[PDB]
Amino acid sequence: GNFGSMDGDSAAAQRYTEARMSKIALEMLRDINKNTVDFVDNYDANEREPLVLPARFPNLLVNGATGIAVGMATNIPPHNLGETIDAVKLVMDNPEVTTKDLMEVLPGPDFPTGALVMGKSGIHKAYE
Amino acid sequence: TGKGSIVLRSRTEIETTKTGRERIVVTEFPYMVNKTKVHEHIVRLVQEKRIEGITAVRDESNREGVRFVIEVKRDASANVILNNLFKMTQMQTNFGFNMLAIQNGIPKILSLRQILDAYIEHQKEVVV
């Protein structure tokens, strides 16, 4: 359905859009049938829900954060799939990595649109 | 001798949901009991903070048949809570007797035989 772009678009057609499950969600949330995650009951006392989820990647790095200032907001930048995989492999193989190692397996945070980030030590202080 | 109090309990059961949650379900009560005053006393026991586990205090559809349901969270020992009901609440009934008779003005007291004996000799005089 209608969702627009980064334009100032207002899709008032609420139920008229179409959606369902996504491809990454499929393997992203398996293993429910394996008692992996705990559950709590709702206020309606009829069905349960999990407080956390099983993961197949740290989406922490894949999608960032744009918080609000309840005490303070939070910016977290997005990153790349395979770069995150290589970071996982790096920390797996070595518990003794450095921040230059992070500079290798993550050359920099990225966007679905693209920009230019000229600085280096700001990135350094960001990851430290 | 027609004297003494006896103990009386309500038809009260533990029932499991499709979720495994347990339910205290009563059908009726002993003699001289209000639904609503005991229900207020239940809301007291909630705010009196002297009984735990209890979540739902509900009552519906009662005119096809009397259905009052208390519903309690897990890890609560619901049968011990039923024991606490028939200790402290008015669901337990100490029903006392006093049959101090009057036969032709003067006060008396009868056994179950003597009642029927006076009945017999009354029927004698009736049919004669």
Side-chain angles (χ1 to χ4, degrees), chain A residues 21-64:
Chain A
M21 303 176 73
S22 296
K23 300 294 182 70
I24 308 170
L26 292 171
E27 292 180 352
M28 178 58 198
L29 288 178
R30 288 180 178 176
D31 300 332
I32 182 169
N33 301 320
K34 296 174 181 179
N35 294 115
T36 58
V37 181
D38 300 334
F39 288 95
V40 293
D41 180 71
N42 55 5
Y43 186 74
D44 297 330
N46 52 6
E47 290 178 352
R48 69 178 184 174
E49 63 186 5
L51 187 60
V52 295
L53 289 178
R56 293 296 176 270
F57 50 88
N59 199 3
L60 292 166
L61 303 172
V62 178
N63 292 318

mmCIF file of all heavy atoms in Angstrom, chain A residues 21-64:
data_model
loop_
_atom_site.group_PDB
_atom_site.id
_atom_site.type_symbol
_atom_site.label_atom_id
_atom_site.label_comp_id
_atom_site.label_asym_id
_atom_site.label_seq_id
_atom_site.Cartn_x
_atom_site.Cartn_y
_atom_site.Cartn_z
ATOM 1 N N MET A 21 4.269 -11.166 6.875
ATOM 2 C CA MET A 21 5.605 -11.556 7.305
ATOM 3 C C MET A 21 6.649 -11.236 6.247
ATOM 4 O O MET A 21 6.368 -11.220 5.047
ATOM 5 C CB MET A 21 5.625 -13.059 7.584
ATOM 6 C CG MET A 21 4.603 -13.512 8.610
ATOM 7 S SD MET A 21 4.571 -15.302 8.836
ATOM 8 C CE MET A 21 6.088 -15.566 9.745
ATOM 9 N N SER A 22 7.868 -10.988 6.702
ATOM 10 C CA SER A 22 8.970 -10.668 5.818
ATOM 11 C C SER A 22 9.985 -11.798 5.846
ATOM 12 O O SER A 22 9.940 -12.684 6.704
ATOM 13 C CB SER A 22 9.612 -9.335 6.211
ATOM 14 O OG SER A 22 8.682 -8.279 6.040
ATOM 15 N N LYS A 23 10.900 -11.756 4.876
ATOM 16 C CA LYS A 23 11.837 -12.854 4.678
ATOM 17 C C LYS A 23 12.830 -12.954 5.824
ATOM 18 O O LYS A 23 13.164 -14.056 6.270
ATOM 19 C CB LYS A 23 12.572 -12.675 3.353
ATOM 20 C CG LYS A 23 11.655 -12.653 2.148
ATOM 21 C CD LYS A 23 10.990 -14.003 1.956
ATOM 22 C CE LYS A 23 10.091 -14.022 0.732
ATOM 23 N NZ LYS A 23 10.876 -13.965 -0.532
ATOM 24 N N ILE A 24 13.297 -11.812 6.324
ATOM 25 C CA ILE A 24 14.267 -11.828 7.405
ATOM 26 C C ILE A 24 13.596 -12.236 8.705
ATOM 27 O O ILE A 24 14.222 -12.866 9.568
ATOM 28 C CB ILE A 24 14.928 -10.448 7.506
ATOM 29 C CG1 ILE A 24 15.464 -10.041 6.144
ATOM 30 C CG2 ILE A 24 16.102 -10.496 8.419
ATOM 31 C CD1 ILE A 24 15.920 -8.618 6.090
ATOM 32 N N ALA A 25 12.305 -11.929 8.841
ATOM 33 C CA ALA A 25 11.556 -12.280 10.041
ATOM 34 C C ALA A 25 11.413 -13.785 10.201
ATOM 35 O O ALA A 25 11.370 -14.278 11.338
ATOM 36 C CB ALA A 25 10.179 -11.624 10.004
ATOM 37 N N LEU A 26 11.366 -14.510 9.076
ATOM 38 C CA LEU A 26 11.140 -15.953 9.067
ATOM 39 C C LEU A 26 12.215 -16.693 9.848
ATOM 40 O O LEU A 26 11.932 -17.351 10.855
ATOM 41 C CB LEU A 26 11.097 -16.458 7.626
ATOM 42 C CG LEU A 26 9.921 -16.023 6.762
ATOM 43 C CD1 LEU A 26 10.165 -16.436 5.331
ATOM 44 C CD2 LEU A 26 8.649 -16.650 7.274
ATOM 45 N N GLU A 27 13.462 -16.580 9.411
ATOM 46 C CA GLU A 27 14.543 -17.170 10.182
ATOM 47 C C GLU A 27 14.910 -16.337 11.397
ATOM 48 O O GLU A 27 15.520 -16.875 12.324
ATOM 49 C CB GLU A 27 15.766 -17.380 9.292
ATOM 50 C CG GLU A 27 15.539 -18.446 8.235
ATOM 51 C CD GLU A 27 16.744 -18.678 7.348
ATOM 52 O OE1 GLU A 27 17.718 -17.907 7.450
ATOM 53 O OE2 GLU A 27 16.718 -19.640 6.552
ATOM 54 N N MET A 28 14.519 -15.060 11.425
ATOM 55 C CA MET A 28 14.836 -14.193 12.551
ATOM 56 C C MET A 28 14.122 -14.634 13.821
ATOM 57 O O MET A 28 14.680 -14.540 14.920
ATOM 58 C CB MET A 28 14.474 -12.758 12.189
ATOM 59 C CG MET A 28 14.708 -11.743 13.269
ATOM 60 S SD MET A 28 16.415 -11.684 13.818
ATOM 61 C CE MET A 28 16.199 -10.850 15.382
ATOM 62 N N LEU A 29 12.904 -15.151 13.691
ATOM 63 C CA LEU A 29 12.165 -15.534 14.887
ATOM 64 C C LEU A 29 11.701 -16.983 14.876
ATOM 65 O O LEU A 29 10.524 -17.261 15.120
ATOM 66 C CB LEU A 29 10.969 -14.613 15.093
ATOM 67 C CG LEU A 29 11.368 -13.213 15.543
ATOM 68 C CD1 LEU A 29 10.144 -12.330 15.672
ATOM 69 C CD2 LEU A 29 12.119 -13.304 16.856
ATOM 70 N N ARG A 30 12.611 -17.912 14.603
ATOM 71 C CA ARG A 30 12.309 -19.331 14.743
ATOM 72 C C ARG A 30 12.410 -19.753 16.209
ATOM 73 O O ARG A 30 12.493 -18.924 17.120
ATOM 74 C CB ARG A 30 13.242 -20.169 13.876
ATOM 75 C CG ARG A 30 12.978 -20.100 12.395
ATOM 76 C CD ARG A 30 13.976 -20.972 11.669
ATOM 77 N NE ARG A 30 13.758 -20.998 10.229
ATOM 78 C CZ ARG A 30 14.553 -21.633 9.375
ATOM 79 N NH1 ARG A 30 15.620 -22.281 9.820
ATOM 80 N NH2 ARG A 30 14.288 -21.613 8.077
ATOM 81 N N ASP A 31 12.360 -21.070 16.433
ATOM 82 C CA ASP A 31 12.687 -21.749 17.688
ATOM 83 C C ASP A 31 11.745 -21.392 18.836
ATOM 84 O O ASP A 31 12.099 -21.570 20.008
ATOM 85 C CB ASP A 31 14.143 -21.488 18.093
ATOM 86 C CG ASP A 31 15.128 -21.969 17.043
ATOM 87 O OD1 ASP A 31 14.794 -22.918 16.302
ATOM 88 O OD2 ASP A 31 16.231 -21.392 16.950
ATOM 89 N N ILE A 32 10.547 -20.891 18.521
ATOM 90 C CA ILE A 32 9.510 -20.710 19.531
ATOM 91 C C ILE A 32 9.058 -22.055 20.078
ATOM 92 O O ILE A 32 8.734 -22.180 21.265
ATOM 93 C CB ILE A 32 8.342 -19.892 18.940
ATOM 94 C CG1 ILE A 32 7.255 -19.634 19.988
ATOM 95 C CG2 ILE A 32 7.779 -20.536 17.671
ATOM 96 C CD1 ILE A 32 6.211 -18.636 19.554
ATOM 97 N N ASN A 33 9.108 -23.097 19.257
ATOM 98 C CA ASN A 33 8.666 -24.430 19.616
ATOM 99 C C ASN A 33 9.704 -25.196 20.408
ATOM 100 O O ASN A 33 9.583 -26.417 20.556
ATOM 101 C CB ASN A 33 8.312 -25.202 18.348
ATOM 102 C CG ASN A 33 7.220 -24.528 17.557
ATOM 103 O OD1 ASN A 33 6.260 -24.009 18.123
ATOM 104 N ND2 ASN A 33 7.366 -24.515 16.240
ATOM 105 N N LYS A 34 10.731 -24.510 20.909
ATOM 106 C CA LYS A 34 11.867 -25.153 21.552
ATOM 107 C C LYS A 34 12.092 -24.612 22.959
ATOM 108 O O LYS A 34 13.177 -24.805 23.519
ATOM 109 C CB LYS A 34 13.112 -24.978 20.685
ATOM 110 C CG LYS A 34 12.980 -25.680 19.338
ATOM 111 C CD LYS A 34 14.145 -25.403 18.419
ATOM 112 C CE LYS A 34 13.963 -26.091 17.073
ATOM 113 N NZ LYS A 34 15.096 -25.815 16.146
ATOM 114 N N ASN A 35 11.081 -23.929 23.516
ATOM 115 C CA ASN A 35 11.052 -23.430 24.898
ATOM 116 C C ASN A 35 12.217 -22.501 25.204
ATOM 117 O O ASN A 35 12.690 -22.439 26.338
ATOM 118 C CB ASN A 35 11.013 -24.574 25.912
ATOM 119 C CG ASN A 35 9.737 -25.371 25.828
ATOM 120 O OD1 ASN A 35 9.753 -26.553 25.490
ATOM 121 N ND2 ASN A 35 8.618 -24.727 26.132
ATOM 122 N N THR A 36 12.666 -21.773 24.193
ATOM 123 C CA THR A 36 13.897 -21.013 24.306
ATOM 124 C C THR A 36 13.716 -19.764 25.151
ATOM 125 O O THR A 36 14.594 -19.413 25.945
ATOM 126 C CB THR A 36 14.382 -20.650 22.913
ATOM 127 O OG1 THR A 36 13.363 -19.894 22.247
ATOM 128 C CG2 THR A 36 14.650 -21.912 22.125
ATOM 129 N N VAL A 37 12.590 -19.086 25.000
ATOM 130 C CA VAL A 37 12.374 -17.777 25.592
ATOM 131 C C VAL A 37 11.256 -17.896 26.616
ATOM 132 O O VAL A 37 10.290 -18.636 26.408
ATOM 133 C CB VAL A 37 12.038 -16.742 24.496
ATOM 134 C CG1 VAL A 37 11.836 -15.335 25.059
ATOM 135 C CG2 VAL A 37 13.127 -16.738 23.438
ATOM 136 N N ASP A 38 11.397 -17.181 27.727
ATOM 137 C CA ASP A 38 10.369 -17.169 28.748
ATOM 138 C C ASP A 38 9.164 -16.348 28.286
ATOM 139 O O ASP A 38 9.184 -15.674 27.252
ATOM 140 C CB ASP A 38 10.936 -16.609 30.046
ATOM 141 C CG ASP A 38 12.086 -17.435 30.568
ATOM 142 O OD1 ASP A 38 12.135 -18.643 30.262
ATOM 143 O OD2 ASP A 38 12.945 -16.875 31.279
ATOM 144 N N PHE A 39 8.097 -16.412 29.076
ATOM 145 C CA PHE A 39 6.841 -15.764 28.736
ATOM 146 C C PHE A 39 6.205 -15.169 29.981
ATOM 147 O O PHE A 39 6.482 -15.590 31.105
ATOM 148 C CB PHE A 39 5.861 -16.745 28.093
ATOM 149 C CG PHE A 39 6.234 -17.149 26.709
ATOM 150 C CD1 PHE A 39 6.952 -18.305 26.483
ATOM 151 C CD2 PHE A 39 5.872 -16.366 25.633
ATOM 152 C CE1 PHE A 39 7.299 -18.671 25.203
ATOM 153 C CE2 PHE A 39 6.205 -16.727 24.355
ATOM 154 C CZ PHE A 39 6.922 -17.880 24.138
ATOM 155 N N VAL A 40 5.350 -14.175 29.761
ATOM 156 C CA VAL A 40 4.505 -13.614 30.803
ATOM 157 C C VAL A 40 3.076 -13.544 30.286
ATOM 158 O O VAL A 40 2.827 -13.462 29.079
ATOM 159 C CB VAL A 40 4.976 -12.219 31.274
ATOM 160 C CG1 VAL A 40 6.312 -12.311 31.990
ATOM 161 C CG2 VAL A 40 5.073 -11.267 30.098
ATOM 162 N N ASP A 41 2.135 -13.585 31.219
ATOM 163 C CA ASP A 41 0.725 -13.460 30.892
ATOM 164 C C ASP A 41 0.355 -11.994 30.714
ATOM 165 O O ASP A 41 0.925 -11.105 31.353
ATOM 166 C CB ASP A 41 -0.118 -14.104 31.996
ATOM 167 C CG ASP A 41 -1.607 -14.013 31.734
ATOM 168 O OD1 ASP A 41 -2.107 -14.707 30.824
ATOM 169 O OD2 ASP A 41 -2.276 -13.247 32.455
ATOM 170 N N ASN A 42 -0.606 -11.747 29.826
ATOM 171 C CA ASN A 42 -1.108 -10.399 29.611
ATOM 172 C C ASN A 42 -1.971 -9.946 30.790
ATOM 173 O O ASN A 42 -2.229 -10.687 31.741
ATOM 174 C CB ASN A 42 -1.879 -10.325 28.290
ATOM 175 C CG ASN A 42 -3.017 -11.345 28.189
ATOM 176 O OD1 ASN A 42 -3.320 -12.080 29.129
ATOM 177 N ND2 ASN A 42 -3.638 -11.401 27.018
ATOM 178 N N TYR A 43 -2.440 -8.703 30.709
ATOM 179 C CA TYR A 43 -3.444 -8.244 31.656
ATOM 180 C C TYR A 43 -4.788 -8.913 31.406
ATOM 181 O O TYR A 43 -5.613 -8.986 32.320
ATOM 182 C CB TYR A 43 -3.574 -6.722 31.577
ATOM 183 C CG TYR A 43 -4.489 -6.114 32.616
ATOM 184 C CD1 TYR A 43 -4.088 -6.009 33.944
ATOM 185 C CD2 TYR A 43 -5.745 -5.633 32.270
ATOM 186 C CE1 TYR A 43 -4.918 -5.449 34.901
ATOM 187 C CE2 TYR A 43 -6.582 -5.072 33.221
ATOM 188 C CZ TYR A 43 -6.162 -4.983 34.532
ATOM 189 O OH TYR A 43 -6.988 -4.427 35.481
ATOM 190 N N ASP A 44 -5.006 -9.430 30.197
ATOM 191 C CA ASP A 44 -6.255 -10.087 29.843
ATOM 192 C C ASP A 44 -6.331 -11.530 30.328
ATOM 193 O O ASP A 44 -7.378 -12.162 30.139
ATOM 194 C CB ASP A 44 -6.441 -10.038 28.328
ATOM 195 C CG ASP A 44 -6.563 -8.622 27.806
ATOM 196 O OD1 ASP A 44 -7.070 -7.753 28.547
ATOM 197 O OD2 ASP A 44 -6.137 -8.373 26.659
ATOM 198 N N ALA A 45 -5.240 -12.063 30.900
ATOM 199 C CA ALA A 45 -5.197 -13.355 31.606
ATOM 200 C C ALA A 45 -5.584 -14.536 30.718
ATOM 201 O O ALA A 45 -6.056 -15.565 31.204
ATOM 202 C CB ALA A 45 -6.065 -13.335 32.867
ATOM 203 N N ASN A 46 -5.380 -14.404 29.430
ATOM 204 C CA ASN A 46 -5.837 -15.404 28.477
ATOM 205 C C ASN A 46 -4.742 -15.905 27.548
ATOM 206 O O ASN A 46 -4.749 -17.084 27.185
ATOM 207 C CB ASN A 46 -7.003 -14.813 27.676
ATOM 208 C CG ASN A 46 -6.671 -13.459 27.073
ATOM 209 O OD1 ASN A 46 -5.537 -12.984 27.151
ATOM 210 N ND2 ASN A 46 -7.671 -12.820 26.481
ATOM 211 N N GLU A 47 -3.812 -15.043 27.148
ATOM 212 C CA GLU A 47 -2.715 -15.423 26.272
ATOM 213 C C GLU A 47 -1.410 -14.852 26.809
ATOM 214 O O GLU A 47 -1.397 -13.932 27.629
ATOM 215 C CB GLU A 47 -2.959 -14.958 24.826
ATOM 216 C CG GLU A 47 -4.079 -15.722 24.123
ATOM 217 C CD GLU A 47 -4.343 -15.232 22.717
ATOM 218 O OE1 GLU A 47 -3.761 -14.202 22.323
ATOM 219 O OE2 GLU A 47 -5.137 -15.882 22.004
ATOM 220 N N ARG A 48 -0.306 -15.420 26.343
ATOM 221 C CA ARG A 48 1.018 -15.083 26.837
ATOM 222 C C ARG A 48 1.786 -14.286 25.795
ATOM 223 O O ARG A 48 1.357 -14.138 24.649
ATOM 224 C CB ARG A 48 1.802 -16.345 27.183
ATOM 225 C CG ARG A 48 2.157 -17.139 25.953
ATOM 226 C CD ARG A 48 2.965 -18.347 26.312
ATOM 227 N NE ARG A 48 3.396 -19.063 25.123
ATOM 228 C CZ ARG A 48 4.217 -20.104 25.147
ATOM 229 N NH1 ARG A 48 4.708 -20.529 26.303
ATOM 230 N NH2 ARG A 48 4.564 -20.703 24.020
ATOM 231 N N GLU A 49 2.960 -13.811 26.201
ATOM 232 C CA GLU A 49 3.802 -13.015 25.320
ATOM 233 C C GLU A 49 5.238 -13.086 25.816
ATOM 234 O O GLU A 49 5.467 -13.253 27.020
ATOM 235 C CB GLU A 49 3.317 -11.561 25.263
ATOM 236 C CG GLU A 49 3.388 -10.814 26.583
ATOM 237 C CD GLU A 49 2.767 -9.438 26.505
ATOM 238 O OE1 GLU A 49 2.194 -9.107 25.447
ATOM 239 O OE2 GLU A 49 2.861 -8.681 27.493
ATOM 240 N N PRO A 50 6.217 -13.022 24.920
ATOM 241 C CA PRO A 50 7.614 -13.035 25.364
ATOM 242 C C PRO A 50 8.164 -11.633 25.550
ATOM 243 O O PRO A 50 7.840 -10.716 24.790
ATOM 244 C CB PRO A 50 8.325 -13.774 24.229
ATOM 245 C CG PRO A 50 7.525 -13.418 23.026
ATOM 246 C CD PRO A 50 6.099 -13.261 23.473
ATOM 247 N N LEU A 51 9.003 -11.451 26.564
ATOM 248 C CA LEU A 51 9.549 -10.125 26.811
ATOM 249 C C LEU A 51 10.742 -9.838 25.913
ATOM 250 O O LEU A 51 10.989 -8.680 25.570
ATOM 251 C CB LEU A 51 9.926 -9.983 28.286
ATOM 252 C CG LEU A 51 10.356 -8.604 28.787
ATOM 253 C CD1 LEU A 51 9.246 -7.595 28.572
ATOM 254 C CD2 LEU A 51 10.730 -8.666 30.254
ATOM 255 N N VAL A 52 11.481 -10.869 25.513
ATOM 256 C CA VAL A 52 12.590 -10.744 24.583
ATOM 257 C C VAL A 52 12.370 -11.727 23.441
ATOM 258 O O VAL A 52 11.333 -12.381 23.353
ATOM 259 C CB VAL A 52 13.957 -10.976 25.255
ATOM 260 C CG1 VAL A 52 14.245 -9.888 26.275
ATOM 261 C CG2 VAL A 52 13.995 -12.339 25.907
ATOM 262 N N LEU A 53 13.348 -11.810 22.551
ATOM 263 C CA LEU A 53 13.229 -12.589 21.330
ATOM 264 C C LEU A 53 14.507 -13.372 21.077
ATOM 265 O O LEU A 53 15.569 -13.024 21.601
ATOM 266 C CB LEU A 53 12.936 -11.689 20.124
ATOM 267 C CG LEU A 53 11.545 -11.073 20.084
ATOM 268 C CD1 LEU A 53 11.409 -10.173 18.880
ATOM 269 C CD2 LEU A 53 10.501 -12.168 20.066
ATOM 270 N N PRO A 54 14.431 -14.443 20.290
ATOM 271 C CA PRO A 54 15.649 -15.045 19.746
ATOM 272 C C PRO A 54 16.095 -14.309 18.496
ATOM 273 O O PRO A 54 15.295 -13.752 17.743
ATOM 274 C CB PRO A 54 15.211 -16.475 19.407
ATOM 275 C CG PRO A 54 13.771 -16.343 19.098
ATOM 276 C CD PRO A 54 13.246 -15.276 20.016
ATOM 277 N N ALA A 55 17.400 -14.317 18.276
ATOM 278 C CA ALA A 55 17.975 -13.496 17.229
ATOM 279 C C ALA A 55 18.851 -14.325 16.310
ATOM 280 O O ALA A 55 19.356 -15.389 16.674
ATOM 281 C CB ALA A 55 18.791 -12.340 17.807
ATOM 282 N N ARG A 56 19.012 -13.811 15.096
ATOM 283 C CA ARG A 56 19.960 -14.360 14.144
ATOM 284 C C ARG A 56 20.946 -13.315 13.662
ATOM 285 O O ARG A 56 21.744 -13.601 12.764
ATOM 286 C CB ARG A 56 19.225 -14.992 12.966
ATOM 287 C CG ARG A 56 18.460 -16.195 13.408
ATOM 288 C CD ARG A 56 19.419 -17.246 13.900
ATOM 289 N NE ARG A 56 18.730 -18.413 14.426
ATOM 290 C CZ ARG A 56 18.369 -18.536 15.696
ATOM 291 N NH1 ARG A 56 18.633 -17.558 16.554
ATOM 292 N NH2 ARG A 56 17.745 -19.629 16.108
ATOM 293 N N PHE A 57 20.931 -12.130 14.274
ATOM 294 C CA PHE A 57 21.869 -11.031 14.097
ATOM 295 C C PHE A 57 21.569 -9.959 15.130
ATOM 296 O O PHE A 57 20.425 -9.828 15.575
ATOM 297 C CB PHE A 57 21.810 -10.437 12.687
ATOM 298 C CG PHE A 57 20.433 -10.099 12.229
ATOM 299 C CD1 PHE A 57 19.876 -8.861 12.491
ATOM 300 C CD2 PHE A 57 19.697 -11.024 11.515
ATOM 301 C CE1 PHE A 57 18.607 -8.566 12.068
ATOM 302 C CE2 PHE A 57 18.439 -10.735 11.092
ATOM 303 C CZ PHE A 57 17.889 -9.501 11.362
ATOM 304 N N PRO A 58 22.553 -9.187 15.527
ATOM 305 C CA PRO A 58 22.275 -7.962 16.284
ATOM 306 C C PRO A 58 21.725 -6.834 15.421
ATOM 307 O O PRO A 58 22.473 -6.009 14.885
ATOM 308 C CB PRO A 58 23.638 -7.605 16.889
ATOM 309 C CG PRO A 58 24.624 -8.284 16.031
ATOM 310 C CD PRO A 58 23.978 -9.546 15.564
ATOM 311 N N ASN A 59 20.391 -6.804 15.289
ATOM 312 C CA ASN A 59 19.666 -5.712 14.636
ATOM 313 C C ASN A 59 19.892 -4.361 15.315
ATOM 314 O O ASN A 59 19.562 -3.329 14.722
ATOM 315 C CB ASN A 59 18.171 -6.052 14.622
ATOM 316 C CG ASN A 59 17.370 -5.260 13.587
ATOM 317 O OD1 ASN A 59 17.903 -4.470 12.815
ATOM 318 N ND2 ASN A 59 16.064 -5.488 13.578
ATOM 319 N N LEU A 60 20.387 -4.358 16.561
ATOM 320 C CA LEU A 60 21.013 -3.197 17.195
ATOM 321 C C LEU A 60 21.892 -2.406 16.244
ATOM 322 O O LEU A 60 21.798 -1.179 16.151
ATOM 323 C CB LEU A 60 21.880 -3.674 18.357
ATOM 324 C CG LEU A 60 21.307 -4.291 19.619
ATOM 325 C CD1 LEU A 60 22.453 -4.940 20.341
ATOM 326 C CD2 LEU A 60 20.730 -3.212 20.488
ATOM 327 N N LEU A 61 22.742 -3.111 15.517
ATOM 328 C CA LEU A 61 23.641 -2.483 14.575
ATOM 329 C C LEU A 61 23.016 -2.338 13.201
ATOM 330 O O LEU A 61 23.383 -1.430 12.450
ATOM 331 C CB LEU A 61 24.916 -3.313 14.499
ATOM 332 C CG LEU A 61 25.507 -3.418 15.906
ATOM 333 C CD1 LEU A 61 26.665 -4.392 15.948
ATOM 334 C CD2 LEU A 61 25.929 -2.051 16.420
ATOM 335 N N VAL A 62 22.054 -3.195 12.872
ATOM 336 C CA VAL A 62 21.483 -3.180 11.532
ATOM 337 C C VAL A 62 20.564 -1.981 11.360
ATOM 338 O O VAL A 62 20.634 -1.259 10.361
ATOM 339 C CB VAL A 62 20.745 -4.498 11.261
ATOM 340 C CG1 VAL A 62 20.100 -4.481 9.880
ATOM 341 C CG2 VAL A 62 21.687 -5.675 11.445
ATOM 342 N N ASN A 63 19.691 -1.754 12.328
ATOM 343 C CA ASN A 63 18.842 -0.579 12.359
ATOM 344 C C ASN A 63 19.175 0.204 13.617
ATOM 345 O O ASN A 63 19.316 -0.381 14.696
ATOM 346 C CB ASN A 63 17.369 -0.975 12.326
ATOM 347 C CG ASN A 63 16.966 -1.580 11.002
ATOM 348 O OD1 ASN A 63 17.362 -1.099 9.944
ATOM 349 N ND2 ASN A 63 16.182 -2.646 11.051
ATOM 350 N N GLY A 64 19.318 1.519 13.475
ATOM 351 C CA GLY A 64 19.724 2.371 14.574
ATOM 352 C C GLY A 64 18.571 2.747 15.481
ATOM 353 O O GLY A 64 17.523 2.097 15.512
#
